[PDB]
Design a protein around this ligand. Structure first.
Ligand SMILES: CCCCCCCCCCCCCCCCCC(=O)OC[C@H](COP(=O)(O)OCCN)OC(=O)CCCCCCCCCCCCCCCCC
Ligand SMILES: CCCCCCCCCCCCCCCCCC(=O)OC[C@H](COP(=O)(O)OCCN)OC(=O)CCCCCCCCCCCCCCCCC
Ligand SMILES: CCCCCCCCCCCCCCCCCC(=O)OC[C@H](COP(=O)(O)OCCN)OC(=O)CCCCCCCCCCCCCCCCC
Ligand SMILES: CCCCCCCCCCCCCCCCCC(=O)OC[C@H](COP(=O)(O)OCCN)OC(=O)CCCCCCCCCCCCCCCCC
Ligand SMILES: CCCCCCCCCCCCCCCCCC(=O)OC[C@H](COP(=O)(O)OCCN)OC(=O)CCCCCCCCCCCCCCCCC
Ligand SMILES: CCCCCCCCCCCCCCCCCC(=O)OC[C@H](COP(=O)(O)OCCN)OC(=O)CCCCCCCCCCCCCCCCC
Ligand SMILES: CCCCCCCCCCCCCCCCCC(=O)OC[C@H](COP(=O)(O)OCCN)OC(=O)CCCCCCCCCCCCCCCCC
Ligand SMILES: CCCCCCCCCCCCCCCCCC(=O)OC[C@H](COP(=O)(O)OCCN)OC(=O)CCCCCCCCCCCCCCCCC
Ligand SMILES: CCCCCCCCCCCC(=O)OC[C@H](COP(=O)(O)OCC[N+](C)(C)C)OC(=O)CCCCCCCCCCC
Ligand SMILES: CCCCCCCCCCCC(=O)OC[C@H](COP(=O)(O)OCC[N+](C)(C)C)OC(=O)CCCCCCCCCCC
Ligand SMILES: CCCCCCCCCCCC(=O)OC[C@H](COP(=O)(O)OCC[N+](C)(C)C)OC(=O)CCCCCCCCCCC
Lengths: 491, 90, 64, 158, 205, 506
């Protein structure tokens, strides 16, 4: 019911917006009536469609059993089996909640073609949401790569000055790396004749073949989180992509890599994952430490936030490769907490400052608290969330991820605690400068945060603190789903 | 109502039976969560004994503390994949 | 901005420009050029197959 | 509510000022954007561009959708995580542990007395808390024997 | 105890100890060196005849310039190919078989020897950069099993019963390790300890 | 039907007077002939009956369910191509009159269709040589149909010389086999498959590789496709590959009986080089047809990997890939022919000269297509994304099915190289999309009355005048939606490819 309704309804929504806005192309040269107020009616229809998608997952959430082991809502549609568990359910809801936020963040800061942008946003959201409910490797890859087509055009049309560089980077870094993941999927379909999740989870392959399959998949996953040294696409893509593209990229697209570990590595390549964990920890720890020190020297506001996202997703990778429930739950909570804080920091840095001054150079901004006090409150509040200050979901995710690493590997997992210091070094260096000293001589006094931008900031802050104070809303759903990923034989 | 664990071992089933392997996987998960429940109850006894005994906690709670330190290494979730995919006797 | 660009976009752009410039010089309408290549390929039939990797190394030398 | 007679007044008055860049009783309905003749739609925009030309950050057109569709959706999400009758695996396991204690000790007068008087809401509050309840024998029996059956599923040893 | 690292290597037939009669490296390199120098030198003097036959035709001259080899390339190419053949066979004899590391070493050295002859007017570091790139390509070629896995392919394994045609059965446990392309339902726990070792959740905590 | 109706059309064309309308109506008669040919062929040939393989004409020909599918595909694609010359592509006489100025255009196509359909059926070396000449000669005559064009004639000279050298190589291979065995029938030669020199058949494949533009013989095809008129380049770049690749598959099916791995290595060497040239070759080019020529070279390398592996998974891969690639090829050239109507007109640096044969010649003539026609621009984006291999488009399943067959046979290197080749070629595929759309916002509010389409008049100023003709618009709509929505019927289509057998049986 879920997948069938989520696809059929959105196709009707896509066709409806095309029919209304393209009925007058034929040398009418008219003035229409939907083109008024920057295509307000067409924007409103797409905004409504995004909210309705959140209602569809809710109807299937009411019947979700947290005390059932296995996939639920098992459905067949387009010759593909679709199912949900505790892990998938939360990631689907996170993906769909950000849909309205992506549209509303670009409500009035596009030069034109609002119908195209709204369709692409709703198209990106559904394809990413469907990626959490597929039940085979090939369906995972189809949805993993289908987002590249709209994302490539979204950046190149609505992007910043270096959009051409950013569009090529996202298309080539992600497509080339995922084709290595396709090689591993083809091998599974050749030797086992199926790519079904449950079917492949029960098969033990030779330790040499598991190594080759792990490397193929990890290449696709490592580029998309991203990890060092294949991370160089992300800062360029984030600084040039539109605000809605940055929100979806920083809120959902990066979380597909962690879900890739949960599906494509842990239950099917269990023996070889234990072998690779020290290598994963070394790569991730250096990803965390290097990205934090590199973030210090950055001079672009939207690139600083982009490098901040890489540091925290290294911690998510460390937690998910811990072989205990504490690390796995911590990595998942950190994924959800990051899914709200990171888009909020892009709205503050690339959606409020950029929409007023159209410059992302750090040297132009200081003392903003004198004439933008409301902006400074949200900037300061989200900065402490971004560094894992307690009472925030980020801390609960970070503390359990660090604890899970220590339990997994006491010696090298202890280096993960540098996230506490290093994240505060670069994040509070930027915030201390935007809110420090006299109001900048290079800026003219203008409006403070508007009602729309207050609304976006409030509804990204609220879930972060609710999860931070009472994470059992999330841990109860994840408890039985996460316990299946642990591999150990104690005697 | 309160569902119950379908006690089913990997050692007594054919994995080609999809529903039987599902039960053995669930059966092993539910027995590990109960041991986590038992460990927390034992830790509850340790905390109450420590608070009440005051300076007598070393002697009064000695066997409770000894039992908690023994159960802690293995009264945690281990997953079903480890025992499903490994035969200890071979 | 250093080694990850050399082993990345900037480095591959220079490699692509060098290779594509070589290949652009090989597309021109000339009877003698295509006849020589056709007759040269007949050596793959004559040569024993163990020599394929030496032909592969020789071809990469000619790219330079 | 196109009201073509009203636009003619609006269009004419802007003509009384030939210079450029030197109404609240107006509204449109959903059926107008699709059924007005091509001539009338042109007139409305020509006024709207010129009316806006003759001009903070409010009435942008999103407030109704987000506060009727989105905020209730998050409230419904908040309600579900609060008041949905869903057991987690850890909450199920504690209930199962108390159930097996009852079954192993049917002949126990003391234990079954506490188990029956131990209400379902305080099952997860066993120990020291504000609730005044008797679980001393219940805790005593759990510390005595092991009520899990994990040893019965691993039939292969070294 | 040794570290337990993953081993991502495609299956290859392993010669039994006492097998692998070595190949004469000098003799094999002699045939490649002499045969290449004869052809390259012979084709050089054949093209000089085409030059003399016509030099007022721009079409012929353009095509001849593409295939023209400099003097240092007419000597360097046979030397690089001869050194490659010698070093590839010499390392293969050392290792009782051909390995990707042996081919990486043989190709990079052969490239660097040739590059230092027909690319004299370039910095030394530039020639080493190409030689490392050339050596990596041939090492990758050997790692992937040359042009085809042959008898080690899954199709070959499936025809020999070493595939997964019959399916799986958990009651059957095998002391010997499964085939490269074979999958099983359950494994001996001793094999897991051999692969992973004890520690972080295997046997002990 | 083809042969009988060709004779009537040959005579009828020479009887009536010469006018553009009459040639256009004669082209429509050619459309009816191919449709009747398809209906008659479908009425008598069925996959279930032809599974065994049926000999015809004293065993000179051998049709099976694998051959039959390609014959129907050839007839279907030829139907779509004739719609281009039988209906208006743009509607403007300065551009469309070219397709109606040659009365022998339809005659040559019917001549070539006969050669295309018979070639996969050849069962004798004598008839193999005869048919491969019949197909080649018609291609030369089609390449030179515009004999008042300097580039068209120059291409036909290049085509004739290179294709005659390949034919001599093909003839020389068959003469060597006849000398060895004294036999001419393929099935008789199969009885001595273990004793004839198998590399005598590699020489036969080498001549076939020249005719499909494989590396190192890729140079002439890249040159010819760029110099020929866009209507000619559309046909000659696709049609020879449908038949020759099918014949190569059948020849490689016989070669695999003896399992000569040395022969497998030489072909793998040609595939490896063609991937390198196909991907790196297109990176620095400015002509769209030169870019598509490298795309053709790259997609042929992908299919030849499936042909080289030559297993049960290879039949499904090759059959599906050839069908979906033909539709993508047809769709792209249909759009390129249409969108010449949006070309700006002068009223200058680099002295760029554009001719009537190829109005769209450079990639940057596709600029602002996202503004001029959004639906067509999206249709072109969907096709280009299919060539890239973006799921769930048809091009994704083509690469997926090719990889399955290649990796199942142990071709680890070629599977990795093609996936690297796919990433490299994505750079120049994306450049088309960058030209189409990336400057939309910085150019949306501009006055463009200098287009070719603006030269057309208007009927009444009260009617609605469609900007693109009915037939060409419906074909682009149909093919684009098939490419986009293949996920709906992919399971049923691949089950059909399971039934196509080439002496599998059991
Ligand atoms: C008017 C009547 C509509 C046709 C009714 C019908 O039977 O359509 C078939 C299908 C309904 O589903 P059904 O066959 O009953 O069983 C589920 C398996 N798909 O319904 C469908 O197949 C609808 C499929 C078209 C919509 C999906 C198109 C692809 C969407 C992009 C792919 C997204 C995933 C990647
Ligand atoms: C912002 C900064 C935030 C924090 C940054 C990270 C700081 C933590 C990094 C260090 C990791 C924590 C150290 C914990 C190790 C100490 C554990 C211990 O008890 O030491 C002994 C232990 C084994 O115990 P034992 O019984 O004595 O050995 C004999 C066994 N028959 O094991 C041993 O024998 C000793 C093991 C070697 C310890 C190496 C410590 C150096 C690590 C350097 C990292 C690179 C610099
Ligand atoms: C800037 C953004 C704006 C937002 C900022 C403020 C965010 C809102 C703050 C609250 C966060 C939401 C978390 C509370 C939601 C309710 C959680 C809950 O369900 O409590 C259940 C609790 C035990 O559950 P149970 O025994 O099973 O009985 C209920 C059965 N349905 O049953 C109970 O006993 C309920 C007890 C609730 C106590 C009030 C909680 C409010 C927070 C105060 C405590 C916070 C922790 C203390 C921190 C102080 C600083 C260290
Ligand atoms: C009286 C004298 C008569 C001379 C007749 C020959 C005319 C001169 C031509 C020079 C010799 C080269 C051709 C030699 C024969 C063809 C190769 C061959 O068949 O192998 C012979 C030779 C020895 O190998 P052998 O092991 O004895 O033969 C198998 C025995 N079971 O194997 C070899 O080692 C031959 C050397 C080949 C290696 C160099 C060629 C590769 C580098 C140059 C490439 C040329 C251009 C590339 C062409 C392909 C382009 C796509
Ligand atoms: C004996 C005569 C010489 C042998 C010629 C062999 C011809 C057939 C071999 C296949 C290559 C077909 C490409 C077209 C043939 C090239 C014709 C030619 O030789 O011209 C040389 C050409 C011009 O280079 P240039 O230095 O500027 O001109 C010389 C100036 N005096 O320089 C070139 O650009 C040639 C390189 C063309 C690109 C070929 C690359 C193929 C792929 C090789 C790498 C394979 C990738 C996989 C690697 C991993 C495995 C190790
Ligand atoms: C250009 C030169 C740069 C480095 C070239 C490769 C060096 C890396 C290397 O592996 O060196 C090993 C090489 C011989 O390689 P190998 O086959 O391993 O030797 C036999 C071992 N029993 O030994 C060497 O001679 C180098
Ligand atoms: C005209 C289109 C008619 C389609 C007929 C397709 C066909 O040839 O039949 C299916 C064929 C199997 O046929 P078979 O089983 O052997 O014989 C009895 C079947 N009645 O199976 C096949 O082998 C067909 C292989 C080629 C399939 C090509 C698919 C073409 C897709 C539609 C073309 C686009 C239509 C554009 C519309 C423009 C016209 C306005
Ligand atoms: C963590 C991220 C990982 C992802 C990164 C993966 C890519 C790693 C590869 C990095 C290597 C490329 C980057 C450096 C290349 C720079 C090229 C160059 O600068 O040209 C060198 C030279 C021309 O000289 P020039 O550039 O003008 O001046 C010298 C400047 N010092 O000309 C040359 O010497 C160039 C060498 C000639 C070409 C050799 C061709 C070898 C075969 C092609 C290589 C690729 C093979 C692919 C095979 C499948 C293709 C389908
Ligand atoms: C869930 C599966 C959905 C699949 C269907 C995709 C949508 C089809 C749109 C066709 C109609 C059309 O081209 O219409 C154009 C519309 C709206 O443009 P507009 O602003 O009104 O145009 C301007 C007109 N003015 C000037 C009058 C205002 O653009 C879209 O819709 C864009 C969506 C597709 C972008 C991503 C392409 C990726 C291709 C490969 C996908 C894997
Ligand atoms: C396999 C491990 C994971 C790697 C994933 C893939 C990363 C590929 C590198 C990024 C390239 C990129 O983004 O291409 C985009 C760049 C843009 O360059 P630019 O910034 O505009 O500078 C260039 C212009 N200048 C210098 C004048 C300012 O085009 C290129 O350079 C063109 C070369 C394309 C080569 C692509 C091959 C990909 C092979 C992948 C497997 C080896
Ligand atoms: C990254 C993966 C590298 C594997 C490590 C390796 O293959 O190691 C490097 C090998 C060593 O192989 P060796 O020394 O011959 O064998 C080792 C000893 N044995 C015989 C006991 C086993 O050599 C090379 O340089 C080969 C280059 C490999 C490039 C692979 C590209 C990535 C393809 C992705 C596949 C999905």
């Amino acid at each position: 019911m879920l997948v069938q309704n989520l696809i059929i309804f959105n196709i009707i929504g896509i066709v409806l917006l095309v029919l209304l806005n393209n009925n007058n192309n034929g040398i009418l040269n008219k003035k229409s009536l939907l083109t008024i107020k920057n295509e307000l009616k067409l924007k409103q229809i797409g905004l409504i469609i995004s909210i309705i998608n959140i209602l569809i997952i809710i109807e299937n959430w009411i019947g979700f059993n947290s005390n059932y082991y296995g996939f639920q809502n098992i459905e067949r549609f387009l010759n593909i089996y679709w199912g949900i568990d505790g892990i998938s359910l939360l990631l689907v809801l996170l993906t769909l909640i950000l849909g309205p936020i992506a549209i509303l963040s670009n409500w009035k800061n596009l030069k034109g073609y609002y119908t195209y942008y709204v369709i692409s946003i709703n198209m990106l959201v559904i394809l990413m949401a469907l990626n959490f409910i597929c039940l085979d490797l090939v369906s995972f890859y189809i949805l993993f790569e289908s987002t590249l087509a709209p994302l490539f055009l979204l950046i190149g049309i609505y992007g910043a000055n270096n959009k051409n560089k950013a569009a090529y980077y996202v298309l080539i870094y992600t497509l080339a790396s995922s084709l290595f993941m396709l090689l591993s999927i083809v091998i599974y379909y050749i030797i086992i004749n199926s790519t079904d999740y449950i079917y492949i989870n029960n098969i033990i392959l030779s330790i040499n073949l598991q190594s080759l399959l792990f490397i193929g998949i990890i290449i696709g996953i490592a580029v998309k989180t991203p990890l060092m040294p294949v991370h160089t696409w992300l800062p360029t893509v984030h600084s040039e992509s539109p605000l809605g593209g940055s929100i979806l990229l920083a809120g959902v697209i990066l979380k597909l890599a962690i879900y890739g570990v949960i599906r494509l590595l842990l239950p099917n390549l269990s023996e070889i994952s234990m072998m690779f964990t020290p290598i994963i920890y070394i790569i991730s720890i250096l990803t965390l430490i290097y990205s934090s020190l590199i973030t210090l020297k950055q001079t672009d506001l939207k690139v600083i936030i982009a490098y901040s996202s890489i540091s925290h997703l290294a911690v998510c990778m460390i937690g998910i490769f811990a072989n205990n429930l504490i690390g796995i739950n911590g990595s998942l909570i950190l994924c959800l907490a990051h899914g709200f804080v990171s888009p909020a920091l892009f709205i503050l840095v690339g959606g409020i400052l950029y929409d007023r001054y159209h410059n992302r150079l750090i040297n132009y901004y200081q003392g903003l608290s004198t004439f933008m006090p409301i902006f400074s409150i949200y900037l300061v509040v989200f900065s402490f969330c971004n560094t894992g200050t307690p009472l925030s979901g980020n801390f609960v995710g970070e503390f359990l991820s660090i604890t899970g690493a220590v339990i997994r590997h006491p010696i090298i997992g202890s280096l993960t605690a540098a996230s506490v210091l290093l994240s505060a070094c670069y994040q509070m260096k930027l915030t201390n400068r935007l809110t420090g000293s006299v109001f900048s001589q290079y800026l003219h006094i203008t409006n403070d945060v508007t009602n729309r931008e207050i609304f976006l900031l409030n509804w990204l802050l609220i879930p972060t603190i609710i999860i931070g104070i009472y994470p059992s809303f999330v841990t109860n759903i994840l408890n039985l789903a996460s316990s299946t990923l642990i591999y150990s034989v104690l005697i | 109502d309160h569902v119950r664990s379908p006690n089913v071992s990997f050692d007594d089933i054919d994995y080609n039976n999809s529903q039987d392997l599902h039960n053995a996987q669930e059966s092993l998960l539910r027995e590990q969560w109960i041991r986590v429940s038992a460990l927390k109850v034992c830790r509850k006894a340790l905390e109450s004994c420590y608070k009440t005994s005051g300076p007598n906690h070393y002697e009064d709670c000695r066997e409770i503390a000894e039992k908690y330190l023994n159960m802690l290494p293995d009264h945690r979730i281990q997953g079903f994949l480890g025992y499903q995919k490994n035969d200890p006797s071979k | 901005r250093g080694i990850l660009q050399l082993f990345g976009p900037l480095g591959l752009w220079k490699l692509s420009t060098f290779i594509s410039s070589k290949l652009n010089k090989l597309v021109f309408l000339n009877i003698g050029f295509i006849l020589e290549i056709i007759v040269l390929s007949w050596l793959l039939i004559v040569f024993k197959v163990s020599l394929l990797k030496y032909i592969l190394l020789l071809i990469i030398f000619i790219i330079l | 509510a196109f009201n073509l007679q009203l636009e003619k007044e609006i269009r004419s008055k802007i003509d009384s000022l030939p210079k450029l860049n030197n109404v609240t009783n107006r509204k449109l309905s959903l059926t107008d954007y699709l059924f007005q003749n091509a001539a009338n739609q042109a007139l409305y925009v020509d006024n709207e561009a010129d009316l806006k030309e003759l001009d903070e950050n409010e009435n942008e057109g999103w407030e109704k959708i987000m506060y009727v569709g989105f905020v209730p959706t998050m409230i419904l999400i908040f309600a579900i995580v609060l008041f949905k009758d869903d057991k987690s695996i850890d909450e199920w396991a504690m209930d199962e542990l108390l159930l097996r204690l009852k079954e192993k000790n049917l002949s126990d007068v003391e234990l079954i007395d506490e188990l029956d008087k131990l209400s379902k809401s305080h099952v997860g509050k066993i120990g020291a808390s504000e609730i005044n309840k008797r679980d001393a024998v219940i805790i005593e029996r759990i510390l005595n024997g092991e009520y899990d059956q994990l040893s019965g599923l691993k039939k292969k040893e070294l | 105890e040794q570290f337990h690292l993953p081993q991502p290597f495609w299956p290859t037939t392993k010669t039994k100890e006492g097998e692998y009669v070595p190949k004469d490296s000098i003799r094999e390199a002699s045939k490649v060196f002499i045969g290449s120098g004869v052809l390259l030198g012979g084709m050089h003097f054949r093209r000089l005849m085409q030059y003399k036959k016509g030099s007022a035709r721009p079409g012929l001259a353009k095509y001849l310039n593409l295939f023209s080899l400099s003097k240092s390339q007419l000597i360097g190419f046979p030397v690089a190919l001869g050194a490659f053949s010698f070093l590839s066979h010499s390392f293969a004899n050392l290792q009782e078989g051909q390995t990707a590391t042996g081919e990486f070493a043989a190709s990079s050295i052969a490239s660097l020897i040739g590059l230092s002859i027909f690319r004299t007017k370039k910095p030394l570091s530039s020639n080493v950069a190409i030689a490392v790139g050339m050596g990596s390509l041939f090492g990758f070629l050997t790692w992937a099993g040359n042009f085809n896995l042959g008898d080690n392919s899954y199709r070959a394994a499936l025809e020999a019963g070493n595939g997964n045609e019959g399916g799986f059965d958990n009651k059957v446990i095998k002391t010997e390790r499964q085939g490269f392309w074979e999958g099983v339902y359950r494994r001996p726990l001793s094999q897991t300890v051999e692969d992973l070792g004890e520690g972080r959740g295997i046997i002990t905590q | 039907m083809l042969f009988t109706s060709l004779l009537l059309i040959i005579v009828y064309g020479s009887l009536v007077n010469k006018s553009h309308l009459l040639t256009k109506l004669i082209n429509r008669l050619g459309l009816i002939i191919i449709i009747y040919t398809l209906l008659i062929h479908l009425n008598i040939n069925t996959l279930e009956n032809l599974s065994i393989g049926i000999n015809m004409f004293n065993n000179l020909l051998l049709i099976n369910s694998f051959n039959n599918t390609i014959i129907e595909l050839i007839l279907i694609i030829c139907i779509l191509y004739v719609l281009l010359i039988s209906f208006n592509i743009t509607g403007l006489s300065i551009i469309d009159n070219l397709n109606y100025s040659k009365r022998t255009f339809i005659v040559i196509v019917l001549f070539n269709i006969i050669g295309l359909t018979l070639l996969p059926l050849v069962n004798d070396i004598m008839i193999l040589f005869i048919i491969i000449e019949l197909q080649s000669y018609s291609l030369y005559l089609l390449t030179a149909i515009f004999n008042e064009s300097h580039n068209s004639t120059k291409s036909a000279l290049y085509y004739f010389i290179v294709g005659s050298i390949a034919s001599f190589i093909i003839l020389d291979a068959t003469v060597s086999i006849y000398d060895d065995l004294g036999l001419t029938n393929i099935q008789y030669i199969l009885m001595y498959i273990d004793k004839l020199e198998i590399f005598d058949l590699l020489c036969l494949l080498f001549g076939l590789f020249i005719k499909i533009g494989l590396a190192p013989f890729y140079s002439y095809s890249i040159t010819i496709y760029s110099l020929s008129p866009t209507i000619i380049t559309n046909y000659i770049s696709l049609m020879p590959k449908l038949s020759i690749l099918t014949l190569i598959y059948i020849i490689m099916h016989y070669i695999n009986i003896v399992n000569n791995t040395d022969l497998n290595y030489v072909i793998s060497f040609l595939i490896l080089i063609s991937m390198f040239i196909g991907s790196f070759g297109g990176l620095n080019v400015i002509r769209i047809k030169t870019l598509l020529a490298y795309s053709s070279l790259l997609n042929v390398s992908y299919m030849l990997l499936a042909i080289l592996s030559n297993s049960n998974e290879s039949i499904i891969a090759y059959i599906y890939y050839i069908i979906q690639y033909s539709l993508t090829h047809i769709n792209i050239f249909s759009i390129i022919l249409v969108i010449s109507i949006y070309l700006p007109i002068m009223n200058n640096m680099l002295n760029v000269m554009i001719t009537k044969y190829s109005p769209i010649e450079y990639i940057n003539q596709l600029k602002n297509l996202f503004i001029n026609n959004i639906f067509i621009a999206i249709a072109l984006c969907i096709s280009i994304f299919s060539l890239i291999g973006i799921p769930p488009l048809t091009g994704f399943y083509g690469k997926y099915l090719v990889l399955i067959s290649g990796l199942n046979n142990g071709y680890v290197l070629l599977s990795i190289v093609l996936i690297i080749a796919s990433s490299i070629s994505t750079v120049y595929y994306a450049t088309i999309l960058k030209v189409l759309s990336f400057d939309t916002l910085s150019f949306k509010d501009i006055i463009s009355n200098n287009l070719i389409i603006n030269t057309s008049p208007e009927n009444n100023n009260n009617e609605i005048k469609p900007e693109i003709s009915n037939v060409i618009s419906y074909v682009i709509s149909s093919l684009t939606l098939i490419i986009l929505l293949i996920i709906i019927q992919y399971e049923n289509i691949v089950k059909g490819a399971y039934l196509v057998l080439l002496y599998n049986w059991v």
